[PDB]
Ligand binder design. Structure first.
Ligand SMILES: C[C@@H](CCC(=O)NCCS(=O)(=O)O)[C@H]1CC[C@H]2[C@H]3C(C[C@H](O)[C@]12C)[C@@]1(C)CC[C@H](O)C[C@@H]1C[C@H]3O
Ligand SMILES: C[C@@H](CCC(=O)NCCS(=O)(=O)O)[C@H]1CC[C@H]2[C@H]3C(C[C@H](O)[C@]12C)[C@@]1(C)CC[C@H](O)C[C@@H]1C[C@H]3O
Ligand SMILES: *[C@@H]1O[C@H](CO)[C@@H](O)[C@H](O)[C@H]1NC(C)=O
Length: 532
């Protein structure tokens, strides 16, 4: 089957077709379809005007303007609002009424390309593997990151959340123009890790995506995360301003100015440290979503009515915050150096700032219940990893799923926990599933690039890819185009049952009550403490 030229709302598009099997199994590949007209700096997206005759969709366009390794904004260009579609094809004839799985990349909201990092055409987010096995259409798309993506003054002079709008624009395009590619319009599945996970959440919660999303999958990130919303945006708008020589004495004046400023300078004005800083790095992420009067109307925790009829899944990697706490504290040297009570306290202090010393010493105690002297440092270093994992991903997620469940009209909820430890020979032996370790497995990387992967890896990859895809089709992580090695039971507030995910996927896999106690300390105790 060869879809050849497809008829979008903008005109005919034409992409390759790749020979897979001999019994006619193929894969139509479309790279670079524009979903929106090149955006006006610090302005909402506008539909694409359309083209002349036929668009040669054969290559990944350029990512949105972003900083390289903060030394130069040497990446991407203001023009980047495109999407890449993967349609698996059948010998007898072209695919029809298939499920659709859109993917939202993540990079602290300040980084990212729809193609995903690569090495000699080995694109981290190549939706071929996931599409083939699943027999589902993979859609990856670009969106504005960095200041240009979410710069805000707090009020109508420059609301922010442009990046999200872009995301919403893609979805809207995939809703309208997917049937022509053979997809099922009324079966759109949003899925993404980190900022993407937070984005997945935000999109479902946003009243703008009313009837566009059918399924949703957040991973290592949810809207309720601390890093997922900017509480004081105007504090940072003023900063960029002073750097780009704009008037900081009035929002209207600022805005008018910023929109006129050279995007490269607007981008390179902000630089995340990544070095000895007084405060834990969470405090430096500045440009991320915010609450506005329309997209994200209220606090995400209050918007969950909207995702009521949106099947949902959310999970976390057991040691998700390891990455981060690494830079915050060089714990990882489970060799020479050793962390102390003071080093742990300081950490807790910096991570509790909102509630002050009251919340600080309280939290310290609750995380210091168990013990292990300097001789048994391992428990300490692990605890820090646990501290970060809790506030950064676990707890927010835990309240997200729980929250969804309570509000679900008719929508299955599920939660997981990627336990498959990292290969990273650098980290201490006690290392579990770090942040982003889930990615490769979800993308069939173990099958696309076998050498450098072993059975287990192909097993986890196959499992996850088995689940996501079944989910995308029916909503049940067990039902669809593939068989599941272990049954994924729908989440219940009572049991707080989660599917642990790793090599051994049998029956004991679905566990219950993952740190319900800390869910309690944060949701009930620490929360009651006064804001300082
Ligand atoms: C061919 C390898 C590259 C390193 C090389 O072989 N050097 C060894 C001898 S020497 O050093 O050259 O002296 C391969 C084997 C497995 C590979 C990796 C890899 C980059 C690359 O192709 C690697 C690391 C990557 C993370 C690259 C990004 C990608 O999207 C994921 C991918 C996973 C995996 O396939
Ligand atoms: C990470 C937890 C604690 C906050 C965190 O430690 N922030 C660290 C930065 S700081 O140094 O304190 O500033 C989070 C995770 C998800 C959170 C909760 C939460 C309080 C809180 O921030 C929690 C429990 C709250 C009921 C707080 C009020 C809010 O509008 C609803 C919200 C639900 C959810 O976000
Ligand atoms: C501060 O933390 C210590 C433990 O490090 C605790 O004993 C104390 O009660 C806490 N509060 C104050 C005000 O010191």
């Amino acid at each position: 089957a060869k879809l050849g030229s497809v008829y979008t709302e903008g005109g005919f598009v034409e992409g390759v077709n790749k020979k897979l099997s001999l019994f006619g199994d193929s894969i139509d590949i479309f790279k670079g379809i524009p979903f929106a007209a090149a955006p006006k700096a610090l302005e909402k997206p506008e539909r694409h005007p359309g083209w002349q005759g036929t668009l040669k969709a054969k290559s990944f366009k350029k990512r949105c303007l972003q900083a390289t390794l903060t030394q130069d904004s040497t990446y991407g260009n203001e023009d980047c609002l495109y999407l890449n579609i993967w349609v698996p094809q059948g010998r007898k004839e072209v695919s029809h009424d298939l499920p659709v799985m859109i993917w939202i990349y993540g990079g602290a909201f300040l980084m990212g390309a729809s193609q995903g990092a690569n090495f000699l055409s080995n694109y981290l987010y190549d939706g071929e593997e996931i599409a083939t096995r699943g027999n589902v259409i993979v859609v990856t798309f670009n969106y504005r990151v960095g200041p240009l993506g979410f710069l805000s003054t707090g009020d109508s002079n420059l609301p922010g959340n442009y990046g999200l709008w872009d995301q919403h624009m893609a979805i809207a395009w995939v809703k309208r123009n997917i049937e022509a590619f053979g997809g099922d319009p009324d079966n759109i599945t949003l899925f993404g890790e980190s900022a993407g996970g937070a984005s997945v959440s935000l999109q479902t919660l946003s009243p703008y995506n009313k009837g566009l999303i059918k399924r949703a999958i957040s991973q290592s990130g949810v809207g309720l995360c601390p890093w997922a919303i900017q509480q004081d945006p105007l504090f940072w708008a003023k900063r960029i301003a002073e750097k780009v020589g704009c008037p900081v004495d009035d929002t209207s004046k600022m805005a008018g100015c910023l929109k006129i400023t050279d995007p490269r300078a607007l981008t390179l004005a902000y630089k995340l440290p990544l070095g000895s800083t007084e405060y834990p790095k969470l405090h430096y992420l500045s440009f991320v979503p915010v609450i506005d009067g329309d997209f994200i109307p209220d606090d995400p925790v209050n918007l969950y009515a909207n995702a009521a009829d949106v099947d949902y899944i959310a999970g976390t990697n057991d040691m998700d915050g390891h990455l981060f706490v690494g830079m915050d504290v060089p714990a990882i040297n489970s060799n020479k150096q050793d962390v102390t009570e003071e080093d742990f306290y300081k950490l807790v202090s910096g991570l509790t700032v909102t509630k002050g010393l009251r919340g600080a010493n309280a939290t310290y105690e609750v995380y210091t219940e168990p013990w292990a002297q300097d001789s048994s440092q391992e428990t300490r270093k692990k605890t820090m990893v646990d501290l970060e994992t809790d506030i950064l991903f676990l707890i927010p997620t835990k309240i997200a799923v729980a929250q969804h469940k309570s509000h679900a009209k008719s929508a299955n909820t599920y939660t997981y926990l990627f336990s498959q430890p990292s290969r990273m020979p650098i980290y201490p032996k006690w290392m579990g599933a770090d942040h982003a370790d889930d990615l490769q497995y979800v993308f069939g990387k173990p099958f696309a690039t076998p050498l450098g992967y072993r059975a287990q890896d192909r097993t986890v990859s196959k499992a996850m890819i088995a689940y996501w895809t079944n989910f995308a089709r029916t909503g049940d992580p067990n039902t669809g185009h593939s068989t599941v090695p272990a049954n994924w039971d729908p989440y219940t507030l009572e049991d707080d049952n989660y599917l642990e995910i790793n090599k051994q996927m049998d029956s004991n896999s679905m566990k219950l009550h993952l740190r319900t106690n800390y869910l309690q300390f944060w949701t009930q105790t620490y929360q009651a403490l006064p804001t300082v």
